[PDB]
Design a protein. Sequence first.
Length: 194
Amino acid sequence: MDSLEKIKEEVISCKKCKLWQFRTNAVPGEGYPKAEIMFVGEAPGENEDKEGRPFVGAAGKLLTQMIKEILGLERDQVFITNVVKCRPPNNRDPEEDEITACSPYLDRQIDIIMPKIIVTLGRHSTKYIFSKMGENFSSITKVRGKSYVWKYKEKEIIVFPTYHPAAALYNPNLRKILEEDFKKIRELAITPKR
Ligand SMILES: O=c1cc[nH]c(=O)[nH]1
Ligand code: SF4
């Protein structure tokens, strides 16, 4: 049987791709197992690696602030993870073989949580989830800021791509766009399906 607990244990000791050799801590993700909103980023950065926790550096602090101020939620009420769960070396993005190796953990996490909404933060997570959906992916610029319905198992999941929070740290305009995207996510979260 599968569980978020089992996945967490596996990730923490995982050596299924070459990223394990560099890490201090793998980062399985954290949050409410019955979260209505699931956030998926790219991969851990430096502070995430040090702490074993997703989105805790500057970009993460911005994410937390938007979740709190715009969605009206604490981190413990949502679920937050990444498509790749170890920090790639040298500030680089995950290789495709690393996404291929690690993404079954995310698949398993989604299978268990079955959130109402998945917010895909940035191009890597958006491209990955679009591939599972069978939704055409052009670029994050072209696809962000609206919802995509993912018929999955017995339910529908609303997928909402946004820019990654890191992109909003030093760009006032991009930040405003991300905030507006989170306002739209709030409306989707509080509105009953009809
Ligand atoms: O957890 C993290 C931290 C930074 N960037 C991400 O994509 N995820
Ligand atoms: S990135 Fe994923 S697949 Fe690779 S070692 Fe870490 S947990 Fe395992």
